[PDB]
Design a protein around this motif. Sequence first.
Motif, PDB file in Angstrom:
ATOM      1  N   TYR A 156       0.770  -1.228   0.000  1.00 28.62           N
ATOM      2  CA  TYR A 156       0.000   0.000   0.000  1.00 28.62           C
ATOM      3  C   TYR A 156       0.816   1.300   0.000  1.00 28.62           C
ATOM      4  CZ  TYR A 156       0.854  -0.508   5.058  1.00 28.62           C
ATOM      5  OH  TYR A 156       1.485  -0.607   6.286  1.00 28.62           O
ATOM      6  N   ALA A 166       1.505  -4.354  12.077  1.00 31.50           N
ATOM      7  CA  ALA A 166       0.569  -4.266  13.187  1.00 31.50           C
ATOM      8  C   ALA A 166      -0.275  -2.975  13.167  1.00 31.50           C
ATOM      9  CB  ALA A 166       1.308  -4.416  14.504  1.00 31.50           C
ATOM     10  N   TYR A 226       0.406   1.153   8.673  1.00 35.92           N
ATOM     11  CA  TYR A 226       1.234   2.175   8.096  1.00 35.92           C
ATOM     12  C   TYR A 226       2.679   1.694   7.855  1.00 35.92           C
ATOM     13  CZ  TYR A 226      -2.344   5.499   9.649  1.00 35.92           C
ATOM     14  OH  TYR A 226      -3.522   6.180   9.848  1.00 35.92           O
ATOM     15  N   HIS A 253       4.366  -0.189   5.891  1.00 30.64           N
ATOM     16  CA  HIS A 253       4.694  -1.614   5.676  1.00 30.64           C
ATOM     17  C   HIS A 253       5.282  -2.183   6.980  1.00 30.64           C
ATOM     18  CE1 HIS A 253       4.594  -1.752   0.974  1.00 30.64           C
ATOM     19  NE2 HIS A 253       3.499  -1.251   1.500  1.00 30.64           N
ATOM     20  N   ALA A 254       6.361  -2.963   6.911  1.00 26.36           N
ATOM     21  CA  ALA A 254       6.771  -3.815   8.009  1.00 26.36           C
ATOM     22  C   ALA A 254       8.035  -3.213   8.627  1.00 26.36           C
ATOM     23  CB  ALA A 254       7.006  -5.239   7.538  1.00 26.36           C
ATOM     24  N   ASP A 284       6.714  -2.811  14.436  1.00 21.91           N
ATOM     25  CA  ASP A 284       5.598  -3.754  14.147  1.00 21.91           C
ATOM     26  C   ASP A 284       5.773  -5.126  14.805  1.00 21.91           C
ATOM     27  OD1 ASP A 284       3.637  -2.413  12.271  1.00 21.91           O
ATOM     28  OD2 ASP A 284       5.440  -2.253  11.029  1.00 21.91           O
TER      29      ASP A 284
HETATM   30 CA   LIG Z   1       3.673  -1.105   9.911  1.00 18.06          CA
END
Ligand SMILES: [Ca+2]
Length: 164
Positions: A31, A45, A48, A50-51, A55
């Motif tokens: 996204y 988590a 926003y 990504h990872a 998170d």
């Molecule tokens: Ca995130």
Amino acid sequence: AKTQAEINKRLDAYAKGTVDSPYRVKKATSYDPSFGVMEAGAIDADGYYHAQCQDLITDYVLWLTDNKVRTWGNAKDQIKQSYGTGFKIHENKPSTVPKKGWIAVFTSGSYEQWGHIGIVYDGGNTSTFTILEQNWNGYANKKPTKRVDNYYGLTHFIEIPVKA
Ligand SMILES: [Ca+2]
Ligand code: MMC
Ligand code: MMC
Ligand SMILES: [Cl-]
Ligand SMILES: [Hg+2]
Ligand SMILES: [Hg+2]
């Protein structure tokens, strides 16, 4: 609280991409054009960025506390809050060797702006240890991955509660 066996199992499952988490990416997800497509196994988590490194901890702390404690803030902000009873913040002194399942918090040097954070996978010695972390590559796309750290920039450990 979780037993050390449960903790240890969960760390391997993070690294394998099999962790029992509703925040684990099942199918490659995107996204945010600024970041790489999250691979299966990445933990997101908050929905926003990504990872990111934090998170992983958000998920881990939710699991440790039976969903009672959701972390807030960036990596560096974790030492400014309490995850509750039996969690203890330790300064990293040059004696200090962490234990498996503890949370390692980097707040100095290049890590100053947002911090970095991960889970101690092997407590190691005074020279090095093995961390399990997200987003040490900057692209926010990979699942939790193990890396040998030399304590550079590492200022605190969060001791977690462990059930007998
Ligand atoms: Ca995130
Ligand atoms: C849900 Hg621990
Ligand atoms: C050492 Hg707290
Ligand atoms: Cl980070
Ligand atoms: Hg418990
Ligand atoms: Hg640095």
